[PDB]
Each structure stands twice: as C-alpha cells, then as structure tokens.
Amino acid sequence: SLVLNDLLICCRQLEHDRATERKKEVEKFKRLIRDPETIKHLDRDAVFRFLQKYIQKETECLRIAKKKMQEISSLVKYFIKCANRRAPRLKCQELLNYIMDTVKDSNILLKDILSVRKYWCEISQQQWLELFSVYFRLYLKPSQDVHRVLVARIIHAVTKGCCSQTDGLNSKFLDFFSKAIQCARQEKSSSGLNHILAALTIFLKTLAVNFRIRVCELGDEILPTLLYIWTQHRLNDSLKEVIIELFQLQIYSTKWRSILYNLYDLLVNEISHNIAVKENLIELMADICHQVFNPWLQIATQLISKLSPLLMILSQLLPQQRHGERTPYVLRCLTEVALCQDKRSNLESSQKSDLLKLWNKIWCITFRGISSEQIQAENFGLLGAIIQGSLVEVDREFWKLFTGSACRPAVCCLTLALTTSVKMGIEQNMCEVNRSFSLKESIMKWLLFYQLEGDLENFPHLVLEKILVSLTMKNCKAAMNFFQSVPECEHHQKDKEELSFSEVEELFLQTTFDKMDFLTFSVHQNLKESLDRCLLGLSEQLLNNYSSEITNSETLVRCSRLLVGVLGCYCYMGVIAEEEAYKSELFQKAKSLMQCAGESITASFIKKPFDRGEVESMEDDTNGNLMEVEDQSSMNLFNDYSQSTIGAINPLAEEYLAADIRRKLLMLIDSHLHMYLMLLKELPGEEYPLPMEDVLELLKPLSNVCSLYRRCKTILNHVLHVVKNLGQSNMDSENTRDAQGQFLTVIGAFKYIFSVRMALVNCLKTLLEADPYSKWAILNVMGKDFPVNEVFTQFLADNHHQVRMLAAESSRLLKALPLKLQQTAFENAYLKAQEGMREMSHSAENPETLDEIYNRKSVLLTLIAVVLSCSPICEKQALFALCVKKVLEK
Numbered sequence: 001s002l003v004l005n006d007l008l009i010c011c012r013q014l015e016h017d018r019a020t021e022r023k024k025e026v027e028k029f030k031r032l033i034r035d036p037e038t039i040k041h042l043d044r045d046a047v048f049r050f051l052q053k054y055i056q057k058e059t060e061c062l063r064i065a066k067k068k069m070q071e072i073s074s075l076v077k078y079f080i081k082c083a084n085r086r087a088p089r090l091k092c093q094e095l096l097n098y099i100m101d102t103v104k105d106s107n108i109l110l111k112d113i114l115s116v117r118k119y120w121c122e123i124s125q126q127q128w129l130e131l132f133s134v135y136f137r138l139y140l141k142p143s144q145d146v147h148r149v150l151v152a153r154i155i156h157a158v159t160k161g162c163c164s165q166t167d168g169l170n171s172k173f174l175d176f177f178s179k180a181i182q183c184a185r186q187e188k189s190s191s192g193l194n195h196i197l198a199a200l201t202i203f204l205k206t207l208a209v210n211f212r213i214r215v216c217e218l219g220d221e222i223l224p225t226l227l228y229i230w231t232q233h234r235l236n237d238s239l240k241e242v243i244i245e246l247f248q249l250q251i252y253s254t255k256w257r258s259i260l261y262n263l264y265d266l267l268v269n270e271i272s273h274n275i276a277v278k279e280n281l282i283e284l285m286a287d288i289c290h291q292v293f294n295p296w297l298q299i300a301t302q303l304i305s306k307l308s309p310l311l312m313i314l315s316q317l318l319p320q321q322r323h324g325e326r327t328p329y330v331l332r333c334l335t336e337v338a339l340c341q342d343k344r345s346n347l348e349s350s351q352k353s354d355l356l357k358l359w360n361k362i363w364c365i366t367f368r369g370i371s372s373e374q375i376q377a378e379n380f381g382l383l384g385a386i387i388q389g390s391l392v393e394v395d396r397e398f399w400k401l402f403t404g405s406a407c408r409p410a411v412c413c414l415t416l417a418l419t420t421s422v423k424m425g426i427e428q429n430m431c432e433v434n435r436s437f438s439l440k441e442s443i444m445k446w447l448l449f450y451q452l453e454g455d456l457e458n459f460p461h462l463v464l465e466k467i468l469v470s471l472t473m474k475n476c477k478a479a480m481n482f483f484q485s486v487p488e489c490e491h492h493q494k495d496k497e498e499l500s501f502s503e504v505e506e507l508f509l510q511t512t513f514d515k516m517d518f519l520t521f522s523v524h525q526n527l528k529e530s531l532d533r534c535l536l537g538l539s540e541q542l543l544n545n546y547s548s549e550i551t552n553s554e555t556l557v558r559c560s561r562l563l564v565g566v567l568g569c570y571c572y573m574g575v576i577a578e579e580e581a582y583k584s585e586l587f588q589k590a591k592s593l594m595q596c597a598g599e600s601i602t603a604s605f606i607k608k609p610f611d612r613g614e615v616e617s618m619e620d621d622t623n624g625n626l627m628e629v630e631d632q633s634s635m636n637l638f639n640d641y642s643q644s645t646i647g648a649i650n651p652l653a654e655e656y657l658a659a660d661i662r663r664k665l666l667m668l669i670d671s672h673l674h675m676y677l678m679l680l681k682e683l684p685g686e687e688y689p690l691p692m693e694d695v696l697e698l699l700k701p702l703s704n705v706c707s708l709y710r711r712c713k714t715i716l717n718h719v720l721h722v723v724k725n726l727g728q729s730n731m732d733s734e735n736t737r738d739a740q741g742q743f744l745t746v747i748g749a750f751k752y753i754f755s756v757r758m759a760l761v762n763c764l765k766t767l768l769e770a771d772p773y774s775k776w777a778i779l780n781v782m783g784k785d786f787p788v789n790e791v792f793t794q795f796l797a798d799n800h801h802q803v804r805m806l807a808a809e810s811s812r813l814l815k816a817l818p819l820k821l822q823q824t825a826f827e828n829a830y831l832k833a834q835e836g837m838r839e840m841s842h843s844a845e846n847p848e849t850l851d852e853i854y855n856r857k858s859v860l861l862t863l864i865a866v867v868l869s870c871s872p873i874c875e876k877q878a879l880f881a882l883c884v885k886k887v888l889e890k
Contacts, residue, residue, distance in 0.1 A: 039087035054097035094122035104135035145186035165736035192230025195237035261291035285317035297333035330369025359402035404431030420453035438474035556625035599626035669703035680720035701741030840879035
C-alpha cells in the first residue's frame with residue numbers, strides 16, 4: 001500500500017546531502033512532482049516527508065553549497081515546486097523553514113516573494129509567533145533596497161494588526177527605520193508604508209505617541225517628490241492623526257504642527273501655481289483650510305485671487321474647503337470669491353469653471369456669517385447671469401440646483417419644463433417644488449410639458465422624483481391621465497427582451513402610479529398599468545433563466561433596480577411596497593427560484609494574506625448576476641413576509657454546501673421565524689471550519705442581531721448563538737473586534753456558556769479594561785435603558801464593579817485616563833438618562849482617584865444640558881453627606 005514511498009524519499013534525501021546531490025536530489029524532486037498519494041497522506045502519514053522537503057532539503061543545500069549562487073536558486077525552485085501543491089497548509093514548516101530562508105535567520109534576497117506568497121494558509125490560520133514579521137523590519141532597516149521585502153513586511157504588519165491585533169516596540173523601531181530611510185535611500189514608494197502601518201496600529205495609542213516624529217518625517221518627505229505614493233500615504237496619515245489632534249486641542253507640539261501646516265500650504269500653493277491634478281489640488285485646498293482653521297481667511301482669499309480646467313478645480317475646492325472647515329465667515333474674505341467668479345463664465349468652455357460659486361455662497365449664507373443684503377444681491381445677480389448663460393450642457397447638473405436651493409430665478413421654468421435634452425432635470429424639479437406643492441405650478445401647461453419631456457430618460461435615480469413631479473398638481477389631476485398613458489404607450493411600443501429598455505427601465509415607471517394615486521385600494525383600480533409592466537419584466541427573466549450564457553449583466557442590472565423594497569412603514573416606501581409585492585406575486589417568483597437553484601448547482605495583498613478574507617468581498621467576478629438575483633429574491637421575500645413558500649426552498653438550497661458558499665451565507669444572514677434554525681446551524685459549521693482570523697465576525701453580527709430579534713422553539717437558536725459567541729468569549733485573544741456585536745446583542749435582558757443566559761454581564765465587564773479605550777462604553781446605555789425595581793440595583797452593582805475594575809489601572813497614565821475617567825463619565829451619563837443615576841458616588845470616587853483634574857466640570861455641564869443649571873450639583877447635596885470625608889467631600 002505504497003509503504004516504501006516514504007523509505008525511498010528518505011533514502012533519496014540522505015543520498016543528496018553532500019555526496020550525491022546531483023542525482024538523488026533530482027530523483028526526490030521528480031518524486032515530489034509526481035506526488036503519488038502524497039498530498040492525501042500529508043494531512044493524515046506523509047507529514048514527515050512533507051517537512052523533510054523544507055527542513056532536511058534546506059539542511060542538505062546549506063551543506064552542499066558550503067560564489068556559485070546557482071545552488072540557492074535551485075533550492076528556492078525546489079521549495080517553490082514542493083509548495084505549489086497548495087493542498088496542505090504547512091503551519092509548522094512556515095515558522096521554521098521560512099524563518100531560516102528569509103532575510104533574517106551570505107544572502108541572495110530571492111525567496112522574499114516566495115515567503116510573501118506562501119502566507120495564504122499560514123498567516124490566515126495561526127500567526128501567534130509573528131517572529132518573521134518583526135525580523136523583517138530589522139532586515140529592511142539596512143541599506144538593502146528590496147521593494148519586495150518592504151511590501152512583504154508591510155503585508156506582515158497588516159496581518160499582525162488584523163488577525164493578531166498586536167504590534168512591536170510600540171511602533172518605535174519602524175519609525176526609527178523610516179526616519180533613516182527618508183534621508184537617503186531607495187524604494188521610497190515601498191518604504192512609505194510606515195505611515196499606513198502606524199495608522200493601522202493606532203489602537204491604544206495617544207496623540208502624543210504618534211505626532212512625535214510626524215513633523216520630522218514630513219519635513220524630509222516634502223523635499224522629495226520622486227515617489228508620489230509615499231507622499232500620498234504621509235499626507236493621509238497626517239490628515240488622519242495630526243488633524244484630529246489639532247481639532248481636539250482646539251476644542252479642549254503645537255509650534256511644530258503649525259510649522260508643518262505652513263510648509264504644507266506653501267508646497268500646495270507652489271504645486272497649484274488633469275483629473276489626478278485636480279483631486280490633488282482639492283485635497284491640498286482642504287488641508288490648507290483645515291490648517292487655517294486653527295487674517296488666515298484674508299490670506300487664503302488673496303492667494304486664491306493671485307484656464308477653465310484650473311478655475312473649475314479651484315471653485316470645486318472652495319466649496320469642499322468650506323464644507324471641511326465649518327463656521328465660514330461672510331466677510332470680505334468670502335466676498336472676494338464671488339467678486340472674482342461673477343464674470344468667470346466668459347468663454348464657451350462649459351467645464352463648470354464659474355460653477356460652485358453660487359453653491360458656496362448659498363451654503364455660507366444659510367450656514368453662518370451675516371444676513372447682508374449686498375451679498376444676497378450679488379448671489380442673485382450671479383444666478384441670473386448663469387441662467388442667462390445657460391450652462392445646461394455640463395455645469396447646470398449641480399450649479400443650477402445649488403442656485404435654486406439658495407432661495408427655495410423663476411425665469412427658468414421653461415428650461416425646467418423643456419429639460420428633455422438625470423442629474424439636472426430631477427434637481428431642477430426638486431428645487432422648483434421645494435417651496436410648496438403648487439408653488440411653481442402657475443403655468444397649467446408646465447406640468448404637461450415636464451411630463452412629456454421626462455419620457456426621454458426612460459435615469460435610475462429618478463425613481464423618487466415621481467412623487468415630486470405628481471405633487472405639482474395639488475389635487476387637480478390635470479395631466480395625470482396623459483402622464484399615465486404616455487408611459488404605458490411607450491412600454492407597449494418599445495417591448496423587447498434582448499434589446500434596450502429592459503425590465504429595469506420597464507419597472508422604473510411602474511412605481512410612479514403608486515406615488516401619485518396610492519400615496520396622494522386607492523391605486524388598485526388601474527391593474528392593467530401594473531400587469532403590462534409585469535408582462536414586460538417577465539420577458540427578460542424567463543429567457544435568461546434557461547439561457548445560462550455569458551454577458552448576463554442586463555439581468556443583474558434589472559434585479560438590482562427591482563430590489564428596491566420597503567421593509568417597513570413609510571410614505572414613499574409604503575406606496576412602493578404594493579408594486580414591490582402585490583405587482584409581482586408569483587409571475588416571476590418561480591422563474592427566479594429556478595434560476596437561483598441552477599446557479600447554485602452550477603491590490604492582491606488581501607488575497608495573499610487571507611483566502612477567507614479574499615473570498616469575503618473580492619473572491620471573483622463570476623456568478624455576479626446570480627448573486628444579484630439571489631439578493632433581489634431575498635429582498636422580495638423579506639418585503640412580502642402571494643407565493644410565500646418560495647423563500648422556504650431557498651434556505652435548503654443555500655444551506656446545501658464550502659468555500660464558495662460565503663456569498664450565499666452572507667445573503668442569508670441578512671434576512672417561519674421559529675423554523676429558521678437551519679440558518680443558525682449552517683453558521684456554526686462555517687465558524688468551526690474558519691480560523692476566526694478574517695472579518696466574518698462583522699457579518700456574523702447581523703445574523704446574531706436577527707436571531708436575537710426573532711427569539712423549546714428558541715432553544716436551538718439560543719444554543720447556536722451561545723456556540724457562536726463562545727468562539728470569541730473562550731479565546732478572547734487577537735480578535736479586538738468581536739466585542740462589538742456581543743455587547744449590542746444584549747437587548748432584552750431577563751459551564752462556560754452558562755453565564756451568557758441573556759445576561760452579557762461578565763463579557764461586558766471584561767471587555768472594558770483589556771480592550772480599546774472608548775469602544776465598549778458606547779453600549780453601556782443598553783444595560784440600564786429600561787430598568788426595573790431589582791434591575792436598578794443590579795445595574796448599580798454592575799456600575800460599581802466596572803468602576804472598581806477600571807480603578808485598578810510613560811503613556812500608561814494617558815492610556816488609563818480615557819479608560820478610567822471618560823468611561824466613568826459615560827457610565828454616569830448613561831445611568832442619568834431616566835432614573836437610578838447615583839452620580840454622587842462616582843463624582844466622589846473620581847476625586848480620590850485624581851479623575852476630576854481632567855476638566856470634569858465641562859463634561860458635567862454638557863451632560864446636564866437636558867436639566868436646569870447646576871441641577872446635578874444641587875441634587876447631589878443629599879447624597880454627598882453620606883460620604884473619612886471631612887475635607888475630601890468639599
């Protein structure tokens with residue numbers, strides 16, 4: 001039974017150490033390429049034979065090659081050929097042989113790509129060691145310009161931050177290496193990943209431990225412009241960390257930050273003095289506005305005052321800057337913008353050069369500054385000039401809407417009614433109907449002209465504009481019959497399955513009658529208007545179900561456009577639920593079910609780091625139309641919950657398989673209720689086979705919330721929920737994210753999993769200290785939202801235990817402060833919502849723990865906004881007397 005294969009392999013390996021490595025090694029390589037019952041026995045008794053191809057082979061190559069660099073290349077090729085089987089994971093070999101053949105154990109620096117690609121199943125299963133990830137930084141710290149090794153180190157850091165939730169030396173060695181590599185080195189685009197690594201490792205890191213060498217690195221990065229990726233990453237890390245730090249300091253190394261901001265603004269002005277260039281200029285203007293926002297506005301206006309593709313970019317960046325920086329002044333600084341852009345539209349260029357000026361003006365006027373008449377008259381004159389210029393070609397898609405939103409001038413009624421030549425027409429209609437229903441409906445023929453002109457777009461986003469177009473009649477029904485007969489006639493004329501105007505365009509006008517008659521049964525009399533749309537939509541469904549051919553994007557688009565349901569009670573959704581469910585009950589349900597059954601029957605750094613992580617979102621583009629049809633069918637079933645039994649067969653088909661079933665599992669997790677135990681049981685088999693290192697726990701939270709909202713009958717559901725929560729409660733290591741769903745699913749309060757019987761007390765108490773700060777305290781209100789007589793004392797004891805656990809704990813003091821004072825303040829604010837506050841004891845304990853020195857008066861005043869002035873301080877007088885508190889209580 002092939003019992004001599006292992007002996008032959010061992011003999012060939014022993015004969016190829018140093019004596020006869022010319023032929024025995026070739027024989028071993030040929031035997032490994034043949035692999036007769038090798039991959040099947042490696043997972044059960046070929047483990048030693050598979051380990052000898054990485055350990056014994058390396059020990060033989062190091063002795064044979066103890067100049068002549070061909071031996072290392074041959075060994076690397078043999079290792080790649082042995083590892084290309086992809087059947088096993090080789091978790092034990094990936095820690096020894098990879099660490100021995102990597103840069104850090106005279107070197108060739110050739111196995112870096114192999115070690116980076118071999119982390120498909122090794123880094124996604126078990127990364128507890130993470131020794132190579134830390135050694136890669138020290139290996140790349142030298143003058144060895146290896147962009148591949150740098151990318152591998154970045155990928156290893158990302159894996160350690162995602163699946164391991166750890167770092168090294170508090171991100172100090174990486175910063176010290178980047179500071180020396182930014183001075184004089186090569187591969188700047190590969191070395192610029194230090195900013196991304198620090199941003200990913202920002203957990204439990206204050207602003208003082210991140211902005212220390214930030215300006216020192218930015219000063220050296222601003223001088224070089226060879227690699228734009230490193231500069232972009234540095235700017236992103238800056239705008240993510242230093243901007244937030246400056247905002248917090250202004251709301252509560254300032255000179256270095258100001259100098260860096262001034263240098264960035266100077267470089268931005270120099271660069272300003274293409275689409276990518278326009279985006280860079282917009283980002284630079286946003287950064288300059290953020291820097292000016294803690295005579296800065298006047299300086300910025302003078303710089304802007306001192307080319308249509310550049311004027312348009314500047315105008316777009318000005319509104320973006322005014323949005324990013326609140327509290328805009330309406331003074332001469334902003335007035336100089338309108339004064340300059342009043343006569344901007346001089347040439348025939350319709351590239352929106354003059355546009356966005358009225359947008360920024362109306363935004364500032366409605367937001368803040370002053371109700372000055374001069375600025376209003378200037379904006380009105382600019383809007384009139386733009387309407388006379390008639391930039392309907394390109395810029396009026398946003399400029400006209402922004403000018404109409406400035407007041408709701410009215411001379412554009414003819415242009416809005418004749419807008420058949422839809423980001424412009426729908427916006428103009430919404431701006432004209434923004435005042436009232438029949439405000440701009442003075443012309444009785446304007447509504448008919450608009451209804452006749454709207455037949456040119458059928459615009460998938462204009463489905464909501466049907467109610468705004470039908471509201472202009474104001475209980476008149478003048479051109480309602482004409483508008484209803486024009487769409488039916490157009491659908492009867494243009495009726496094709498493989499040509500344009502597919503089911504999406506046919507159903508885009510089906511919900512228009514429900515938003516006119518059913519919204520303002522009511523519209524159940526005109527059943528022919530819905531039957532025609534159903535017959536037009538059922539033509540491309542039954543034909544595509546039996547086709548199963550390539551280029552099926554039309555069916556996918558139709559299913560994505562028809563998946564707009566209600567799933568609740570509202571006005572626009574309440575009127576559209578009839579067309580979503582009653583219009584198509586069983587005409588296409590059976591065809592969709594058959595198509596789904598048939599489909600079920602028959603950059604790249606994320607893919608290499610985790611196969612499960614890749615299959616989660618970016619597996620492949622195959623079966624995209626199938627996934628879209630499945631999602632549309634699930635949404636239709638959820639909205640309906642005739643032909644309600646179609647959804648029952650979909651569950652047994654989706655839970656039949658299973659690495660390619662992740663899409664079906666995620667589609668089914670988003671969805672009678674008592675018999676839904678199959679969906680919960682299928683999640684356990686997937687969680688048992690997964691290494692819990694991917695981001696599937698975030699998608700599992702939706703299914704957990706659905707099961708908690710749904711739940712003898714619920715015993716199996718509770719058991720499945722406990723089994724799913726155990727995978728993160730029993731381990732409680734290297735996840736750093738699964739504590740968000742468990743704390744949120746504690747709604748409805750009544751061995752290892754016995755304490756989780758609808759309590760979630762121990763998990764919420766343990767997820768406070770040994771977790772990210774200011775993360776678990778947001779859900780503290782769910783524990784005492786609706787209390788009872790005994791539940792009040794229970795929540796008080798829980799808060800006391802939490803305070804006692806938080807009081808038990810360089811940057812350690814700054815890290816414990818947001819975990820001991822901010823958490824206590826959040827708990828007190830949550831307990832002081834309705835009753836059972838008991839904030840006097842917390843305020844007394846904060847003074848003994850030096851927690852009141854963090855400006856607690858501001859937090860108390862912010863939390864007492866719903867009460868009178870000093871209401872808590874006046875009410876705590878009866879409780880402060882109960883406090884070794886002769887002078888400490890004062």
